[PDB]
Structures are given as C-alpha cells and as structure tokens.
Amino acid sequence: QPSTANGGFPSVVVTAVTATTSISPDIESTWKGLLAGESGIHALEDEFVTKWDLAVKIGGHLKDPVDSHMGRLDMRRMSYVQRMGKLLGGQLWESAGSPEVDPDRFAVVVGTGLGGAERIVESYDLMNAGGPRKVSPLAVQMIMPNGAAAVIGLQLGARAGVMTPVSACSSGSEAIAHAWRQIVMGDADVAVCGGVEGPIEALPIAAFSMMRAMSTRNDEPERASRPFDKDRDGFVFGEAGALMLIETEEHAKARGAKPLARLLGAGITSDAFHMVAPAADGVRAGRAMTRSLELAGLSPADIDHVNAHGTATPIGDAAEANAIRVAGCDQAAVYAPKSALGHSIGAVGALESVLTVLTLRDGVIPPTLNYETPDPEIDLDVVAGEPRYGDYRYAVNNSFGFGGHNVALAFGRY
C-alpha cells in the first residue's frame, strides 16, 4: 500500500505562498498580525447595511482592495474572482523567484465557492436594455466558474491540467488535495493551487443569516467570532484569497528553491446527512483526517497541531470536536484562525492551509481570539492568550463545507 512515508508516493513540498486578507495584502505581515492578536473584523461601513436593516453589521473587507490593482481593461474582461486570481497568481510567481518550469508538467487547481455571480446579473441587464448584441463576446469567459483557474493557467502557462473543484467552504482545501494527487499520480511535477472568493455582499449575508449561522454581536466587532467558546453565536465574514506553489522535492532541489513545509496526504469524505448542517457524530469528518494520515504514513500520535475549521457556530464547533476525537487527534494543539480572519467560503481552506505551513516553518501557533470560556462539551487544547511556541512536527488542516464535504490535509515540517 503506497504512502508518502514509505516512498510509494513522491515527496511533495510547499515552496511559495501568497494571500490577501482583512489584516494585510502581504502574507508575512498577516502572519505577524495574527501573532500579535490583531483581528480583521470591524463594523461594516457599507451603505447597504443601513439600506436593508441587516441583522449582521460586522465583517472584514480586504485591507487592500483587489481593484486598487486593476485598470480599465481588467475591469471589463474579468469577474472579481478572476481579477483576484490574476493578482495572486502574479504575486506567487514572483515570490517563487519567477522560475521557468516545463509547461507540460505544470498544473493549476483553484477552487471558489460561487464564481462570477455578479456578471450574470450584469449580462441580463444589458440584454434587457439593448438586446442580444449587447452581451459581450467575452461574457462566457467571465461567467464560467472555472474562470479564476482558467485565468491563472493562461497567465502562468500551465498545460498539465487546470481544474476547479467546488465544495462550498472546503473548495480551497479540496483544490490543494487534487493538486497533490495530480502530482503523486505522475500527471505533474509542479502545481499552483488554492482558492478565491468574492467580497462581502448583502445577499450572502441575508442567506447565511436566515440560517442563524452568523454572529450578530455588533457592538464588539472584534469579539464576535468565538470558535469553541461557550458564548459563540455563529460566524463572521472575512474576505480572502490564497495560493501556494507545490512541487516534488526533487524538482525543488534541482531549481534551488527552499521548501517551507511538506504536503504529505489528503483525505476527502462526505456526510450524506444534511444539505447544510454537519453530522453531529463527526465520524465521516474524522475519517477524512484518518485518510490523510494513512496516505501520509503517519499515526494520530504524530499530530502536534490541528488547524480547525472552527466556524464558531454551536453545532459546527461541536461536530468538529467529535471529528478530532474520532480521528484520535484530540491531544493536539488547536488553532481556529476564523477567530481573527473570519469565514471566506471558498478561499478559506486555502488561506488556512497557508497558515498551517507557516506554523510548521516557524514552530508557533497564533492565539485563538476571544477564547475565554472553554465549552464543557468540546474539551480541546485550544491555543489562546498569546502565541504558543512548540515543537510542531506534523499538522492537519481541516476544512468542511455545506453539503457535508470533508477535506483534511496532512503537512510536515521540512
């Protein structure tokens, strides 16, 4: 039975990372912000909060808006997610030292939660005002939900597959999983992977609020997101997108890139339980963690760190706690980054994958913000108060989404 530890799969390393967040456009500044207990979440100033009388009045917009970096041409040929992908694509390649790779061994895997949804309302309004010929010959290529991956593959020259997995909130982790398969199966040597998501708008707030999924703790915006805390009351939106460069160890050596971490395995399962709620018993979600460990060649006793999905809903954090016990990883140091960065649906698995890699490289877990009263029924070792410096050898990043989609990624210290 092939594993990473026994040489059945080739060794895969993470050689570059890039992200844009509500704390910073630069991933290293974001990481420093996290370690100093900064939050990205504030009062929404947006005129549409008063327009619609929304229950929810908080969230984190990007520190540096994407469209600050976009001229008139970009602004009319691409959806927002494609613009975000082009920016992040371009940044990642520079950080990697702008290498010349073999196009035919190069893959792109990028997820989103939703896609170019603004551009269909637009295209419908143009056809209403002025007929079928007022639809852009370009329209298809903005509208298609593989759109951001298409733009990155085209921008960087990826010829060994450009894929887009959609699994709501676990999209950006699933992308990284499939990029890892694409390589250990022989289809590629190098891959760009991650996830992009649109900005905070009024409809998604309405849809998630109506589920009672979201915090309405508006008087203290930085204190709203409380994963695993006895007093949590739902999640908070925080904008993001993130990409990472992965490649075989042998490929990285040959080009002199220094690895940040290894990516060792991926497990994908599903709940078949409910369309939006996670399964309470956390069994299938725990099994995804186990599957990554099997494929890595690890035991649960090797897992020092879990980067939790921790959305801060009551049933969500309860289910994940069960998942972690089920996997046998409940002795692990836990971090819930959504406590500081919020939930960014399709992107967030990817950004948290980047945080997990930085935890391994730097031997430190930022504090989970607002964790002030352990829930009796959770019983996890949640990092809090200040960063915890520790000997972290292996970690699991969890990502679950609506539909009951479970993704777990096993990373190792290089």
Binding site for ligand TLG (CB under 6 A): 169, 213, 235, 271, 276-278, 311, 313, 316, 319, 343, 400-402, 404, 406
Does 75 participate in binding a copy of itself (rule CB under 8 A)?
Answer: no
Among residues 193, 309, 329, 405, the one annotated as catalytic is: 309
For residue 10, the tally of other CB atoms under 10 A from its CB is 15
Residue whose pair of structure tokens reads 């993130």 in the numeric block: 242
Scanning residues 199 to 218, which ones bind a copy of itself (CB under 8 A)? 202-203, 205-211
Binding site for K ion (CB under 5 A): 307, 309, 352, 397-398
Q: How far is the CB of 270 from a copy of itself (least distance, A)?
A: 4
Out of a copy of itself, K ion, ligand TLG, none, what residue 235 binds, judged by CB under 5 to 8 A for its kind, is ligand TLG
Distance CA 276, CA 233 (A): 17
Scanning residues 123 to 152, which ones bind a copy of itself (CB under 8 A)? 123-124, 127, 131-133, 135-137, 139-141, 143-147, 149-151
Among residues 251, 305, 343, 405, the one annotated as catalytic is: 343
Scanning residues 47 to 66, which ones bind a copy of itself (CB under 8 A)? 52-55
Does 389 participate in binding a copy of itself (rule CB under 8 A)?
Answer: no
Among residues 61, 169, 193, 405, the one annotated as catalytic is: 169
Our CA dihedral for 282, 284, 289, 292, rounded to 10 degrees, sits at 180
Distance CA 100, CA 102 (A): 7
Q: How far is the CB of 269 from ligand TLG (least distance, A)?
A: 10
Q: Which of 236, 232, 215, 313 is nearest to 61 (CA)?
A: 236
Distance CA 270, CA 289 (A): 12
Q: How far is the CB of 289 from ligand TLG (least distance, A)?
A: 13
Helical pair 314-327 and 283-296, crossing angle rounded to 10 deg: 40
How many of the chain's residues bind a copy of itself (CB under 8 A)? 80
- Single-letter code of the amino acid located at 176: I
Distance CA 258, CA 393 (A): 18
Does 158 participate in binding a copy of itself (rule CB under 8 A)?
Answer: yes
Distance CA 285, CA 282 (A): 5
Q: How far is the CB of 369 from ligand TLG (least distance, A)?
A: 18
Helix, strand or coil, per DSSP, at residue 238: strand
Q: How far is the CB of 17 from a copy of itself (least distance, A)?
A: 23
178 is catalytic: no
Q: How far is the CB of 99 from K ion (least distance, A)?
A: 29
- 16 contact partners, CB below 8 Å, separation of at least 6: 92, 95, 96, 244, 245, 257, 260
CB 228 within 8 Å of CB 382: yes
169 is catalytic: yes
Q: Which is nearer to a copy of itself, 316 or 367 (CB)?
A: 316
69 is catalytic: no
Q: Which is nearer to a copy of itself, 97 or 103 (CB)?
A: 103
What residues are labeled active site? 169, 309, 343
